[PDB]
């Protein structure tokens, strides 16, 4: 994900959980050069990312 | 370096004049700013002497201006309790009041 630069890891987890009706194992943030904050969001083992990716339209 | 019979010519430009030179290109436009005020004041107090209140007859001080007569600053107090005009009232009927004139004659 690209995520607003002011976001916490707790904040990112509570939003990804709020939108895509998902649940998060752990959140890994970085800040790309160009200053947009990437956020690799690891979904719980019971949840599949190749599926929720289709709902959000990415693939 | 003087040459052959001039004057002595102490001219005052040593200080710095170029900076504080006051040119008068306002001059003809100021003639007009005042003219409107002069008119706008007369139209504001419509029935009233446009020139202003009445000033007294007065003689000029020094012996060179002995024989002239001026319009003074205001009618004196001693003058007023002869004509029977209260000093605070005259200020309201266009009579300049000068509480500062020693009458000697």
């Amino acid at each position: 994900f690209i995520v607003d630069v002011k976001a916490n890891k707790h904040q990112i987890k509570q939003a990804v959980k709020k939108l895509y009706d998902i649940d998060v194992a752990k959140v890994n943030t970085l800040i790309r050069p160009d200053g947009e904050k990437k956020a690799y969001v690891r979904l719980a083992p019971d949840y599949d990312a190749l599926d929720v990716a289709n709902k959000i339209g990415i693939i | 370096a003087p040459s052959r019979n001039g004057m002595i010519l102490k001219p005052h430009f040593h200080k710095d004049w170029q900076r504080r030179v006051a040119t008068w290109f306002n001059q003809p436009a100021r003639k007009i700013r005042r003219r409107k005020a002069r008119q706008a004041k007369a139209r504001r107090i419509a029935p009233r002497p446009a020139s202003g209140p009445l000033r007294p007859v007065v003689r000029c001080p020094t012996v060179r201006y002995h024989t002239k007569v001026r319009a003074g600053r205001g009618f004196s107090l001693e003058e007023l309790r002869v004509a029977g005009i209260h000093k605070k009232v005259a200020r309201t009927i266009g009579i300049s009041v000068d509480p500062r004139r020693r009458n000697k004659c």
């Binding site: 800040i31 050069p33 160009d34 200053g35 | -």
Partner: protein
């Protein structure tokens, strides 16, 4: 530097996006006088304002 502050990293983020060329359709707008970017930088010559 590889040990950067946050203010320093933001500064490079903005200077790194101003670098790209001009979009080619800009050259098509009505009242143009612009041909090439002329405000580009190259890390070997004209080091950053640092």
């Amino acid at each position: 530097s590889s040990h950067k502050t946050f203010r320093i990293k933001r500064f490079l983020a903005k200077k790194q996006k101003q670098n790209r060329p001009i979009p080619q359709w800009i050259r098509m707008k009505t009242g143009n006088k612009i041909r090439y970017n002329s405000k580009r930088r190259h890390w070997r010559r004209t080091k950053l304002g640092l």
